[PDB]
């Protein structure tokens with residue numbers, strides 16, 4: 001059987017893509033005021049931003065171990081080889097929980113080939129890795145080689161972003177007129193710089209990309225935004241002007257991530273080592 005690719009809502013890939021490429025989907029949980037929702041399935045970013053915009057503190061949770069097991073079980077039974085590219089273990093306990101679920105399943109279904117990669121990635125940084133996995137899988141790339149390659153790919157992904165207010169991230173717990181510029185280091189969020197006004201952080205984001213990027217023109221640059229396509233499209237131009245990039249993938253930030261980053265969040269993703277896949 002062909003390798004089945006699995007991912008969670010931390011990847012920020014549009015459901016149109018998930019469904020098209022038959023990607024098993026594990027929704028992260030979004031909740032507040034007694035109601036639980038499933039990221040990308042029963043809740044949309046606007047509903048979250050709107051809630052926060054109304055003085056609400058939208059919270060998130062890991063999917064349940066039961067939910068995880070229900071998702072993998074079918075594959076274990078038909079004994080189909082799987083690759084689950086998980087949201088950064090430093091941003092959620094989802095990964096570890098899934099490894100636990102994996103052991104349980106192995107006990108019942110030995111021979112079940114399920115590899116879980118702790119991506120150390122978030123949003124489209126993770127999504128880009130998932131899309132590459134889909135490509136390698138449809139090319140019938142050998143299982144181990146495919147898994148090893150996607151892990152190396154994840155190890156070279158950069159996540160450079162800005163939010164409107166660090167309070168959201170702070171109250172969210174993933175971090176302890178100035179706009180902040182942050183980045184993802186080994187799976188964790190690290191506040192990096194402080195700039196006056198939006199225009200400058202965007203200019204600086206594109207600049208840092210040029211410093212860390214590798215063979216940027218040959219790469220598919222990822223850009224995710226918190227319901228602010230206008231700025232994303234703005235950032236896209238600055239990049240094609242400055243770096244001469246031609247391949248882009250823009251998408252909205254998911255609800256779970258959005259509940260932490262907050263409105264006005266803009267991020268770019270690229271490899272610091274051009275792995276040619």
Ligand SMILES: CCCCCCCCCCCCCCCC(=O)O
Pocket residue numbers: 028060061062091092093094122123124159161174189224225253256257260261265266267
């Ligand atoms: C445009 C996005 C750039 C990357 C931004 C990462 C922001 C940190 C997001 C943390 C989301 C936390 C999800 C927690 C899920 C859970 O409750 O286990």
